[model samples]
Each structure stands twice: as C-alpha cells, then as structure tokens.
Target: QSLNPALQEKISTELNNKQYELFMKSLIENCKKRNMPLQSIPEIGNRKINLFYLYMLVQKFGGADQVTRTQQWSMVAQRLQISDYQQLESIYFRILLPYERHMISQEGIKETQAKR
Candidate 1:
C-alpha cells in the first residue's frame, strides 16, 4: 500500500487544535441531512478531520478566492505532496455547512476601499 505517511503527519499536525473540534462537530451534523446511510464526514469522519480538511488549509495558504477551486485543489495537493487531490475536491464540494457556504460566499471584504 502506498501510505501517505508524510501527508498524514503534516495534515494531522496542522489540525491539532481546539477550534477544529468544534468546527468538525458542526461538519458532522451539517454533512448529514443530505446523505442516506450517512453524510460524508460522519460516514467517515475519522479521515475527514485530517485529510479532508485540506480544503480549509488550501484557503489558509491560497488566499481565499483568488484562485479557482479546481486549480487550487491540484496546486495545494501538489505542494503538499498529496495524492488524493480530487478526493478532497469531492469532500470539499459535498461538505458545505453554513460556515462552509459563507466561507466560499466572499463579498466586499476588501473591495470597499474607497472610504480608505
């Protein structure tokens, strides 16, 4: 098996915090009410906490919406030496909570600089 030891370590290390637990908890629920047997995260919430959360990590490094999702998914995975790039894309598109929606639904956060 081609285990992703390095990627696992890097991702596991990245999400080790208090805030993430709360966030993932919501994801577990929000990820539900959609799937039948179970939603995405809770169906396999174990990995979701680490590998899948690369979605947020991408945003952290890639500066939100400057880059498109398709492009950024591959770019971030390549930089991180990740193999399951599209896998993350599936989870990312499927795992949309209120925060997830609002996170992507960017607006005039930096555009209204005329007053400045």
Candidate 2:
C-alpha cells in the first residue's frame, strides 16, 4: 500500500529513536555483508562531521557569523596549537566516529526480533 505522502515524510523524519537505530544497524549489516565499512555509510561519514560542528556551533551560538570551516579550523588550531591537517582530520574522523557510533547505538536497541 502506498503511504500518505505527508505521513510518510513525517514518519521518515521522526522515525522513533528505536526505528532509526535498527535501521542504522540493518544498514550496517547489509553493507558489511557486502564488505562495506560502517564509516563508508552516508549518515556516518559526512553528516557526522557536520553534526559535531553543529553541536559546537550551539555552544558558540549568537554573536557569531555562522560557523564555517575556516572559522572552526581557526578556533581549533588556536586552541590546540596544531597546524597539521592530518591531526585535525584524525580527531574529526577517529575520535568522533566512535562517539557517533555510540550515540547512534544509544538511540535504541540493536536487535528487535529473536532469530529462530
């Protein structure tokens, strides 16, 4: 049956925490079954970096000219005193990935049904 457009859009948007989580899990499983790493996944890859930046943005909200890569890199470099792009990428991709995974996992259950 075709879902109502508005309802489908809303459900896909809200996707109760449980459903979002299992969806992520099933997606990862399906990917891995084809030898795709979870990192290569869409929501996990590019979106995560933006999400982290968004969180920091809230902390730095107001009196700011919106967050941009140039501004963030400057802030991080000033704070960390590091000029190495590799290290910056490391912190963003490495340190943040586990946290992202944990956060995603925290949203709900890994398995909803018992396999026979």
Candidate 3:
C-alpha cells in the first residue's frame, strides 16, 4: 500500500497524553481480542512494550495473510535479536484469555462516527 504523507506526518508527531493512552488501550484491547498472549505479563518492560506495539503495527499492515504474518514475526524477531517468535508466543500463550465478541468491540464509537 502507498503511504499517506499527510497521515504519516500526523502520525510522526509526538503523541499527547490522550493519544498515547488511546494507542495503549487499542494495543491492549487488540491483544485481548486476538488471543495474542501478552495479557499476563505483570510488568510492562521495554521489550514487552515493543512487542505489543509491533503486533499492533502488524495488524495494520499485515492484513490477514499468513505470509505477511510470518514475515512480520520474522522481522520483529530479527529486530529484537531473537531466534524466533516462540519467546513472545510463549509469553502471550501463557496469558491467553477466553474470547468474547464485546472484548474489542467499539460499537458505540463507530456508531457515533458514522452518524456524524
């Protein structure tokens, strides 16, 4: 996909407190819904936080393709200097939660936005 320069510029700018919170919430909620297994990490260290953000980014650019998922995993693992995604997967699976449709639903927000 072609990059959107304006959106890129906006995204590149520093995130204020609210924007940061929204992004954190979105990442946490996405992990919860997809059963990505990071929910149980008691401490939010730099490594875990980076992994969370990487997964969130993967969702945005990876779509639902298996190849892309593999590539994303490889990319992150390499960047993190890990042998594979197993380390991250282990942590995530260790904290995996049961699924619920409402877990990640933003129905009211969507409805309001659509109404506008």
Candidate 4:
C-alpha cells in the first residue's frame, strides 16, 4: 500500500504515457462494462470519452496534479450508479482491485440504503 518515497516520487514524476493510457482505459472500460455513461461524450466500444479521461490524460502528460486514487474509483462507481460509498468500496475491492470481475453481476444497485 505504501511505496517507498523514491519509488513514489518516481511514479509521481514519471509514470509514462503507456501506464497513464492503461489507467484511463481501465476507468473508461470500467464504466462501460457496468452499463454506465460518462455524460457529454460519445461511447466507444462500450466506453465513453469524457472529461474524466481528458483530465487524466493531461494529469499524466502535463503534470497537472495527483488525483486521489480512491476518490477517482468512487466517482466511477457513482457515474456507473453502482451504489453508495460502502457498496462502492465493496465493488472496488471485490471487483476492481482484484481482477475487474463482474461482481455487480445482476441488475440494479446492490444493498443501497433507502433514501431517508
């Protein structure tokens, strides 16, 4: 979970175009595979091209800023309408973190708390 400062700095400094592209692809593909759309962007091969991607592209190549990894994943869950924070975290761990497994394998949101 914790990378040594040197390695972390290295990643912060030079994560490479390919790595960034793969991460972006994962984010887009992650949304698409869940039947979610990123809004205001066209879909490509089930994924949408949107600000999420464009921002990351710039962050990677243009040294914009370091995005919060957890929040990024959570927003993906939100855009996908997966569920709230807990379920989102679960899906992240059960699916995204492990192997991109289709854990949301049935329709609708899973274990969402009813609105008060």
Q: Model 2 — which ten-residue stretch has the worst lDDT?
A: 41-50
TM-score of 1: 0.30
| Consecutive 10-residue window with the lowest summed lDDT within model 3 | 4-13
Local accuracy of candidate 2 as per-residue lDDT tens digits, 31-102: 333432343222321121223333444467442344343476455443322234655564445433544445
Question: What is the Cα-based lDDT of residue 95 in candidate 1?
Answer: 46
Assess each prediction's global lDDT (C-alpha) against the native: 0.42, 0.38, 0.40, 0.39
| Model 2: pairs clashing at backbone N, Cα or C within 3 Å | none
TM-score of each: 0.30, 0.27, 0.30, 0.23
Candidate 1 ranges beyond 4 A from true positions? 1-19, 29-62, 65-72, 77-93, 97-116
> Candidate 3 — which residues are off by over 4 angstroms?
1-13, 17-56, 59-62, 66-70, 77-84, 95-116
**How many clashes show up per model?**
0, 0, 1, 0
Worst 10 residues of 4 by lDDT: 4-13
Model 3 accuracy (lDDT, Cα): 0.40
Misplaced by over 4 Å in model 2 are 1-59, 62-65, 69-73, 76-84, 96-100, 107-116
Q: Mind giving the per-residue lDDT tens digits that candidate 1 earns over 7-112?
A: 2322233356434544544544454335422322232223334323545665566644544544574564445333355565555445444454443234323533
For candidate 3, what is the TM-score? 0.30
User: Which of candidates 2 and 3 is the stronger one according to TM-score?
Assistant: 3
Tens digit of lDDT per residue, candidate 4, span 37-72?
233332222221223444554366443333343345
Per-residue lDDT value at 58 in model 3: 53
